[PDB]
Design an enzyme around this catalytic site. Structure first.
Site, mmCIF file in Angstrom:
data_model
loop_
_atom_site.group_PDB
_atom_site.id
_atom_site.type_symbol
_atom_site.label_atom_id
_atom_site.label_comp_id
_atom_site.label_asym_id
_atom_site.label_seq_id
_atom_site.Cartn_x
_atom_site.Cartn_y
_atom_site.Cartn_z
ATOM 1 N N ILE A 42 0.832 -1.195 0.000
ATOM 2 C CA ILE A 42 0.000 0.000 0.000
ATOM 3 C C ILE A 42 0.867 1.246 0.000
ATOM 4 O O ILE A 42 0.578 2.210 -0.702
ATOM 5 C CB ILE A 42 -0.896 0.096 1.248
ATOM 6 C CG1 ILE A 42 -1.874 -1.066 1.310
ATOM 7 C CG2 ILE A 42 -1.662 1.405 1.210
ATOM 8 C CD1 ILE A 42 -2.628 -1.124 2.631
ATOM 9 N N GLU A 64 4.804 3.286 1.810
ATOM 10 C CA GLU A 64 6.102 3.305 2.470
ATOM 11 C C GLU A 64 6.143 4.185 3.721
ATOM 12 O O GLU A 64 6.480 5.369 3.645
ATOM 13 C CB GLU A 64 7.138 3.814 1.471
ATOM 14 C CG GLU A 64 8.563 3.767 1.955
ATOM 15 C CD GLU A 64 9.150 2.383 1.837
ATOM 16 O OE1 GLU A 64 8.592 1.442 2.448
ATOM 17 O OE2 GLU A 64 10.164 2.241 1.124
ATOM 18 N N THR A 85 7.490 5.745 7.255
ATOM 19 C CA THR A 85 8.840 6.156 7.609
ATOM 20 C C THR A 85 9.604 5.094 8.416
ATOM 21 O O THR A 85 10.830 5.028 8.359
ATOM 22 C CB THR A 85 8.804 7.479 8.394
ATOM 23 O OG1 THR A 85 8.023 7.312 9.583
ATOM 24 C CG2 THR A 85 8.170 8.574 7.548
ATOM 25 N N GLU A 92 -6.232 -0.789 10.830
ATOM 26 C CA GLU A 92 -7.451 -0.840 10.049
ATOM 27 C C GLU A 92 -6.954 -0.597 8.622
ATOM 28 O O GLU A 92 -5.921 0.059 8.413
ATOM 29 C CB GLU A 92 -8.402 0.283 10.477
ATOM 30 C CG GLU A 92 -7.807 1.687 10.320
ATOM 31 C CD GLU A 92 -8.822 2.796 10.572
ATOM 32 O OE1 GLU A 92 -9.919 2.717 9.999
ATOM 33 O OE2 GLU A 92 -8.528 3.751 11.324
ATOM 34 N N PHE A 93 -7.677 -1.116 7.635
ATOM 35 C CA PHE A 93 -7.258 -0.933 6.259
ATOM 36 C C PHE A 93 -7.768 0.368 5.678
ATOM 37 O O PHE A 93 -8.944 0.697 5.778
ATOM 38 C CB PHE A 93 -7.744 -2.084 5.370
ATOM 39 C CG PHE A 93 -7.529 -1.846 3.902
ATOM 40 C CD1 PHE A 93 -8.611 -1.657 3.047
ATOM 41 C CD2 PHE A 93 -6.245 -1.808 3.370
ATOM 42 C CE1 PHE A 93 -8.414 -1.435 1.685
ATOM 43 C CE2 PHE A 93 -6.042 -1.581 2.000
ATOM 44 C CZ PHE A 93 -7.127 -1.396 1.165
ATOM 45 N N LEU A 94 -6.838 1.106 5.098
ATOM 46 C CA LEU A 94 -7.113 2.355 4.414
ATOM 47 C C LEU A 94 -6.064 2.237 3.329
ATOM 48 O O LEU A 94 -5.114 1.464 3.481
ATOM 49 C CB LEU A 94 -6.854 3.558 5.314
ATOM 50 C CG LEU A 94 -7.823 3.625 6.498
ATOM 51 C CD1 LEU A 94 -7.355 4.657 7.521
ATOM 52 C CD2 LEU A 94 -9.206 3.937 5.991
ATOM 53 N N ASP A 134 5.781 14.847 12.549
ATOM 54 C CA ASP A 134 6.142 14.673 11.146
ATOM 55 C C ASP A 134 4.946 14.687 10.209
ATOM 56 O O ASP A 134 4.820 13.843 9.328
ATOM 57 C CB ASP A 134 6.939 13.382 10.946
ATOM 58 C CG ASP A 134 7.539 13.288 9.556
ATOM 59 O OD1 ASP A 134 7.986 14.334 9.032
ATOM 60 O OD2 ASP A 134 7.566 12.181 8.988
ATOM 61 N N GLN A 161 1.310 12.839 2.729
ATOM 62 C CA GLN A 161 1.473 11.398 2.556
ATOM 63 C C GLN A 161 0.957 10.548 3.724
ATOM 64 O O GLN A 161 0.378 9.477 3.520
ATOM 65 C CB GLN A 161 2.959 11.079 2.337
ATOM 66 C CG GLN A 161 3.288 9.601 2.265
ATOM 67 C CD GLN A 161 4.778 9.345 2.126
ATOM 68 O OE1 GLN A 161 5.402 9.764 1.152
ATOM 69 N NE2 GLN A 161 5.354 8.654 3.104
HETATM 70 O O1 LIG Z 1 2.617 4.105 6.888
HETATM 71 S S1 LIG Z 1 1.580 4.860 7.577
HETATM 72 O O2 LIG Z 1 1.218 6.007 6.764
HETATM 73 O O3 LIG Z 1 2.165 5.373 9.014
HETATM 74 C C1 LIG Z 1 0.112 3.855 7.841
HETATM 75 C C2 LIG Z 1 -0.323 3.695 9.185
HETATM 76 C C3 LIG Z 1 -1.470 2.938 9.488
HETATM 77 C C4 LIG Z 1 -2.218 2.326 8.455
HETATM 78 C C5 LIG Z 1 -1.831 2.451 7.096
HETATM 79 C C6 LIG Z 1 -2.598 1.830 6.072
HETATM 80 C C7 LIG Z 1 -2.233 1.936 4.714
HETATM 81 C C8 LIG Z 1 -1.087 2.661 4.344
HETATM 82 C C9 LIG Z 1 -0.270 3.318 5.332
HETATM 83 N N1 LIG Z 1 0.800 3.986 4.991
HETATM 84 C C10 LIG Z 1 1.003 4.744 3.947
HETATM 85 C C11 LIG Z 1 2.304 4.743 3.373
HETATM 86 C C12 LIG Z 1 2.599 5.558 2.244
HETATM 87 C C13 LIG Z 1 1.595 6.380 1.683
HETATM 88 C C14 LIG Z 1 0.293 6.395 2.245
HETATM 89 C C15 LIG Z 1 -0.010 5.586 3.375
HETATM 90 C C16 LIG Z 1 -0.635 3.226 6.746
#
Ligand SMILES: O=S(=O)(O)c1cccc2cccc(Nc3ccccc3)c12
Ligand SMILES: O=S(=O)(O)c1cccc2cccc(Nc3ccccc3)c12
Ligand SMILES: O=S(=O)(O)c1cccc2cccc(Nc3ccccc3)c12
Length: 298
Positions: free
Chosen positions: A14, A16, A18, A81-83, A127, A131
């Site tokens: 999904i 990257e 940090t 949770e999925f996003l 931070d 993104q």
């Molecule tokens: O890594 S985080 O953003 O902390 C993250 C934290 C918690 C749930 C996440 C679910 C999908 C994508 C993420 N990251 C993501 C990475 C790059 C671009 C957009 C989203 C999620």
């Protein structure tokens, strides 16, 4: 329970984070899709564990929900949770037209609610950037990819000494302030507010000094009148060029006096004068705030 990594079928990467890669995964037992962040590195400072514990305590509509934490051989898999949509991807998909003001208002309002909650619970993000702000189908936006005061794990990104996390860094940090405040998050959010509106990052620097000069060229080089104490900060140099402040009619053309008033308060140099997230929620700019649903190609 317990959940085991074998219980999850990986679907697709999904993003990257940090401190770890995030994959879309499927719980083979419940069919529930989740977002798994893998974190890989010995010791973990007592102050570290405490901040992580504080973050884990937070339950809020505008903070991505952590569902479980799976430990396995020097590895940690955070089950969220999925996003899979974020403000950056959304702004890009909406570049040739920009995000509608109602949605800008809604997202900014929600981020301020999330931040106000974190700050009242002694938690800072540190931070903030487009993104890491996740959005769902029903219009919510959530804080994610929190920064860290004291390290222990491993930073998987690259942006560090690059051209990204610096774009939203508060000037007090760039000038060497050891003890900063929750104000640093308001500054980042103010930069994001300007970005959603103009459709371009406000201060895209490539180094700490470049970031500072870009800020100075726009908001004016700060002096003791505007920011008491600035000339004595660790990295302040009297040799800094002295630029005059630019008009917001030029910096963020689309905003009216209400928007400008709020932005100016979020980008105030003096952290002690910078608006708090709580006070920002009561700003007249949000009088007509609603909760629009975003148009995503999902
Ligand atoms: O890594 S985080 O953003 O902390 C993250 C934290 C918690 C749930 C996440 C679910 C999908 C994508 C993420 N990251 C993501 C990475 C790059 C671009 C957009 C989203 C999620
Ligand atoms: O507190 S935990 O819920 O595990 C946790 C949750 C989320 C992120 C973490 C990052 C580093 C260490 C942890 N703790 C840890 C503690 C003991 C052994 C290994 C890692 C983290
Ligand atoms: O992943 S984040 O999106 O920041 C996140 C979002 C929501 C709740 C979190 C709770 C504990 C640790 C996190 N992250 C974390 C990961 C590695 C090291 C330190 C903290 C949490």
């Amino acid at each position: 329970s317990p959940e085991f990594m074998e219980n999850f079928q990986k679907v697709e990467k999904i993003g990257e984070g940090t401190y770890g890669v995030v994959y879309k995964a499927r719980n083979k037992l419940t069919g529930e899709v989740v977002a798994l962040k893998k974190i890989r590195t010995e010791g973990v400072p007592s102050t570290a564990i405490r901040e992580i514990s504080l973050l884990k305590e937070l339950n809020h509509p505008n903070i991505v929900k952590l569902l479980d934490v799976i430990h396995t051989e020097n590895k940690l898999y955070l089950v969220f949770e999925f996003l899979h949509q974020d403000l950056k991807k959304f702004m890009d998909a909406s570049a040739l037209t920009g995000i509608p003001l109602p949605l800008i208002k809604s997202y900014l309002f929600q981020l301020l609610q999330g931040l106000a909650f974190c700050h009242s619970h002694r938690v800072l993000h540190r931070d903030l950037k487009p993104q890491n702000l996740l959005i769902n189908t029903e219009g919510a936006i959530k804080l994610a990819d929190f920064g860290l005061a004291r390290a222990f794990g491993v930073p998987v990104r690259t942006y560090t000494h690059e051209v990204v996390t610096l774009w939203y860094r508060a000037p007090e940090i760039l000038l060497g302030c050891k003890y900063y405040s929750t104000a640093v998050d308001i500054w980042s959010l103010g930069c994001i507010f300007a970005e959603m509106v103009t459709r371009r990052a406000l201060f895209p620097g490539d180094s700490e000094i470049d970031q500072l000069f870009r800020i100075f060229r726009t908001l004016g080089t700060p002096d003791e009148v505007v920011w008491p104490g600035v000339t004595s900060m660790p990295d302040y140099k009297p040799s800094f060029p002295k630029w005059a402040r630019q008009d917001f009619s030029k910096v963020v053309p689309p905003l009216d006096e209400d928007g400008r008033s709020l932005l100016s308060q979020m980008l105030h140099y003096d952290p002690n004068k910078r608006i708090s997230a709580k006070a920002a929620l009561a700003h007249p700019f949000f009088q007509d705030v609603t909760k629009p649903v975003p148009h995503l190609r999902l």
